[PDB]
C-alpha cells in the first residue's frame, strides 16, 4: 500500500498579494521591460 | 492499494490578490512592458 | 484499489481578488503593455 | 514601434501523426486508460 | 524599438510522431493508467 | 533596440518520436501507472 | 510446400488498431 | 516444407495497437 | 524444415503496442 498527502506548490503568494509589474509563469525569449 | 489527497498549486494567490500590471502564465516571446 | 480527492489549481485568487490590467493564461506573441 | 512574428506553439506534432490513445490538453480529474 | 521573431513551443514531437498511451497538458488529479 | 529571435523549448523530441505510456506536462496530484 | 493457420486466435479479440498479418512477402503496409 | 500454428493465442486478446505478423519475408510494415 | 507452434500463449493476454512476430526472413518491421 502507499499513501501521499498534504503536498503544495506555491508561487509568489499564499495569503495576501499585490503586483505592480510583469510576473511570467513561463517564457520563451521576448523582452520584459517592467 | 493507493492514496493522494488533499494536493494543491497556486499561483500569485490563494486568499487575497489584487493586480495593477501584467500576470502571464505561460509564453512564447512577445514584450511585455507592463 | 485508488483513490484521489481534493486536489486543486489556483490561479491569481481563490476567495477575493481585483484587477486592473491584463491577466493571460496563456500566450503566443504579442506586446502586452498593461 | 513594436514587432513579433513567426511564433508557434506545437502541441503534439506538427505533421502527420498517429493516434491510438488519449490525448488531454487540460483535465481537472478523472480516470484515463490508455 | 523592439523585435521578437522565430520563437517557439514543441511539445512531444512537432514532426511524425506516433502514439500509444496518454498525454496529458495539465492534471489538476485524476488515475493515468498507460 | 531589443531584438530577441530563434528561441525554442522542447519537451519531449521535436521529431519523429513514438510513444507507449503516459507523458504529462504538468500534474497537481494522482498516480501514473505506466 | 503446405501451409494451415499461420495466425490463429482461440477464443475473443476485443479490438484491433494496427496490422494482424498472417504472412507477407513484400510491399508497405502502414497500419 | 511444412507450416502449422506459427503464432498461437489460446484465450482473450484484450486489444491489439501493432503488428501482429505470422511470417515475415519481405517489405516494410509499420505498425 | 518442419515448423510447428513457435509461439504460443494459454492465458490471456491484456494488450499489445510491439511486434508479436512468429519467424523473421528480411525486411523491415516498425512497430
Known amino acids: ?3 501521499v498527502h498534504h503536498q ?3 508561487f509568489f503568494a499564499e ?3 499585490s ?3 510583469a ?3 513561463l517564457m ?3 523582452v520584459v521591460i517592467a
Open 23 to 25: 510576473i511570467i509563469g
Open 15 to 17: 495569503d495576501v498579494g
Open 28 to 30: 520563451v525569449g521576448g
Open 1 to 3: 500500500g502507499y499513501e
Open 19 to 21: 503586483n505592480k509589474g
Open 8 to 10: 503544495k506548490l506555491v
